[PDB]
Amino acid sequence: EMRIGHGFDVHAFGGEGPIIIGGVRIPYEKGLLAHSDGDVALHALTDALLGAAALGDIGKLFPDTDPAFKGADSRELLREAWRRIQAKGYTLGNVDVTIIAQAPKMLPHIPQMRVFIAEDLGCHMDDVNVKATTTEKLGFTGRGEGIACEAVALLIK
Amino acid sequence: LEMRIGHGFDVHAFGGEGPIIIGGVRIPYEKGLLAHSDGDVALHALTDALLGAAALGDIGKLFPDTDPAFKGADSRELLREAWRRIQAKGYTLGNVDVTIIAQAPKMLPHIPQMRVFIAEDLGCHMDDVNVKATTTEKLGFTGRGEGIACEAVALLIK
Amino acid sequence: EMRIGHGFDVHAFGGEGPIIIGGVRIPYEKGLLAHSDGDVALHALTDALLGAAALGDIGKLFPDTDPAFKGADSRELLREAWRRIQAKGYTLGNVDVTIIAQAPKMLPHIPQMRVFIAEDLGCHMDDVNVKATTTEKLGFTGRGEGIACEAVALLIK
Ligand SMILES: Nc1ccn([C@@H]2O[C@H](COP(=O)(O)O)[C@@H](O)[C@H]2O)c(=O)n1
Ligand SMILES: Nc1ccn([C@@H]2O[C@H](COP(=O)(O)O)[C@@H](O)[C@H]2O)c(=O)n1
Ligand SMILES: Nc1ccn([C@@H]2O[C@H](COP(=O)(O)O)[C@@H](O)[C@H]2O)c(=O)n1
Ligand SMILES: CC(C)=CCC/C(C)=C/COP(=O)(O)OP(=O)(O)O
Ligand SMILES: [Zn+2]
Ligand SMILES: [Zn+2]
Ligand SMILES: [Zn+2]
């Protein structure tokens, strides 16, 4: 018994760095603006896990509206989403995350991202894949306006 | 036992007057959606994910511009026919997940109804269908309000 | 066990045609700029297969440091990735690729892409889906500045 999910997120650059991606603080000349900490990777992953569980999305569980989630970081949101998915009967298959960013270079921070996600999800590191790619100077990411992320997940019952 | 994955992606540009139709739900908006079809970007991407999982190509291959049969059909009809053809290969539904990418309008209040309509079209339980939405934080064509995109993934079982 | 992977790739138009998509040469006013042959569909597919197996991505597997695959075409890269993935004990479930291009027209060329991909992955044609879509003149693909590709893959252990 297996179930698929998909997530996608974008955050627009603003302010100063560091930016936070997959739980890791990365030195960069500007920050990521958000109601939240702007962790596009953990947000997209959270939506994919919630999607596979038919529990909706991050905004559904954690409205900006609701003061209870004020100041929560993305790993806290991920762990809470995961607790609710697990109470629904699911366990982790695997996840795959694709960060879309012209800069900064992601791959030196990626090992650490994988450990944080694997810790947060109670899974083996081998169940977690993160990668990055540019859009070769094209689009809002290529122009350096923001960063995006796509993620997929497989849950088991 | 045998499960199969598919992915769908669709975009339409805003044009004319609202409402827009997303996941079979009429949503009031200042703009409509330009399409030869009803412009239902969610059902179109979902349809391609399902066809994708079944290796049946895509909506364009099933319903060519030049085939009169389905010219003028709404997207739920196309979804229901695509689905008929997928089941004729011996597939049933695992689950689906849809990700609407739109700066506006707000989708979340209409998602419950979209899910009802998809579940009835696919003959499945509500629990096998997820729909979500995200903005692009005012970035890109979606963020500027030029149109709406949608991705979908699907799992089928043989 | 089944595992899921996701890939995404983009190359900008530049130079003269033809471009190569899914191993198939397609005439066009412009080429695709790239260090490699610029086959976005093969690169996205390769990344989806590597992500499923948690082997990272095409840049991790083939760094500029390694002379072995420098100047290698995208089918050679796909086949090497697939060798590394099979060595981890995986075989193919199925793949689905989505080319995102305003132009050129991809439809007539898709049948040979599928044959080439099934050859390279040692699978049946029925395990390979390839489709194309435009973005209706929106965004960087819509204005003919480049071509993007998404892909997903399911592996079995
Ligand atoms: N068109 C849209 C865009 C987003 N949303 C909801 O609002 C939330 C916030 O979206 P952002 O994270 O892109 O700011 C999402 O998690 C989604 O629940 C919506 O309901 N309709
Ligand atoms: N570059 C592209 C884009 C779309 N197409 C085809 O045209 C059909 C309709 O595309 P749109 O919905 O993007 O207008 C699709 O089925 C696809 O097969 C193509 O063959 N090459
Ligand atoms: N922001 C980014 C973008 C790409 N990368 C790495 O660089 C490689 C090449 O990506 P591009 O093809 O977009 O140039 C990738 O395979 C990825 O491993 C990165 O580490 N950080
Ligand atoms: C969901 C998918 C497929 C995401 C990848 C596409 C992407 C990040 C495009 C960026 O610019 P754009 O296409 O909006 O162009 P521009 O901002 O230059 O109009
Ligand atoms: Zn976010
Ligand atoms: Zn459409
Ligand atoms: Zn590439």
Q: What is the DSSP annotation of A89-141?
A: T-EEEEEEEEEE-SSS--GGGHHHHHHHHHHHHT--GGGEEEEEE--TT-HHH
Q: How many CB atoms are closer than 10 A to CB A126? A: 14
With CA atoms as reference, report the closest residue to B52 among C98, C93, A48.
C98
Q: Could you tell me the maximum CA-CA distance found in chain A, to the nearest angstrom?
A: 45
Q: Residue B109 and residue B63: Cα distance in Å, rounded?
A: 31
**Which three-class secondary structure state does DSSP give residue B5?**
strand
For C:35-94, CB contacts with B below 8 A are 93-94
Phi-psi region of A92 (alpha: psi -120 to 50; beta: other; left: phi over 0): beta
Q: How far apart are the first and last CA of chain B?
A: 7
Cα gap C103→C106, rounded to integer Å? 8
**What does the alpha-carbon distance between residue A27 and residue A43 come to, in Å, rounded to a whole number?**
20
Q: Closest CB to A57: pick one of B7, B132, B138.
A: B132
DSSP reduced 3-state for C41: helix
C contacts of B49 (beta carbons < 8 Å): 96
- A75 contacts A136 by C-beta, under 8 angstroms: no
Pocket test for ligand 3, best of A24, A32, A133 (most atoms within 8 A of CB): A133
What CATH code is carried by the domain that includes residue C85?
3.30.1330.50
In chain B, % helix, strand, coil (3-state, to 5) comes to 30, 30, 35
Q: How far apart are the first and last CA of chain C?
A: 5
Asked whether C40 and C148 are in contact (CB, 8 A), the reply is yes
- Cα dihedral C41→C113→B101→A10 (10° resolution): -10
Tokens of B80: 């229901």
- Tokens linked to C115: 């044959």
| Domain span at C89 | 1-157
Q: Calculate the CA dihedral of residues B99, B105, B106, B111 and round it to 10 degrees.
A: -50
Q: How far is CA C8 from the centre of its chain?
A: 9
Touching subunits for chain B (3+ Cβ pairs under 8 A): A, C
3-state helix, strand, coil in chain C (%, to 5): 35, 30, 35
Query: What single DSSP character describes residue A41?
Result: H
Identify the chains in contact with C, defined as 3+ C-beta pairs within 8 A: A, B
The Cα C29–Cα B66 span in angstroms is 27
Order of strands, sheet of B3-15, starting from the edge strand that comes earlier in the sequence:
B32-33, B3-15, B147-157, B92-101, B129-134
Q: How far apart are CA C141 and CA C102, in angstroms?
A: 6
Question: Which tokens is B5 given?
Answer: 């994955």
Residue located nearest, by CA, to atom 9 of ligand 1: A59
Gap between the Cα atoms of C157 and C155, Å rounded: 7
Phi, psi of B54 (to 5 degrees): -95, 5
| CA-based R_g, chain A, Å | 15
Are A98 and C54 inside 8 Å of each other by CB? no
Is residue B1 packed enough to be buried (19+ CB in 10 Å), middle (13-18) or exposed (0-12)? Answer: exposed
| Integer Cα distance of C89 and B72 in angstroms | 48
Name the residue type at position C9: D
Atom of ligand 1 nearest to the CA of B108: 20
Resolution, Å (one decimal): 2.0
- Residue of C125, C112, C91 lying closest to C41 (CA atoms): C112
Q: CB-hemisphere CA count at 13 Å for B133?
A: 24
Secondary-structure breakdown of chain A: helix, strand, coil percentages, each rounded to the nearest 5: 35, 30, 35
Q: Any chain C CB within 8 A of the CB of A129?
A: yes
Domain count across chain B: 1
Q: Who's near A117: CB < 8 A, 6+ residues apart?
A: A22, A23, A42, A45, A78, A95, A97, A128, A130
Q: Beta-strand (E) ranges in C15-145?
A: 19-21, 24-26, 31-32, 91-100, 128-133
Amino acid identity at A49: L
CB B55 within 8 A of CB B7: no
* DSSP helix/strand/coil, C59: helix
Size of interface A-B (CB pairs under 8 A): 87
Biggest CA–CA distance in chain B, Å, is: 47
Query: In a mutagenesis test of the B interface, which of A9, A10, A149 is the best target, namely the one with the most B β-carbons within 10 Å?
Result: A10
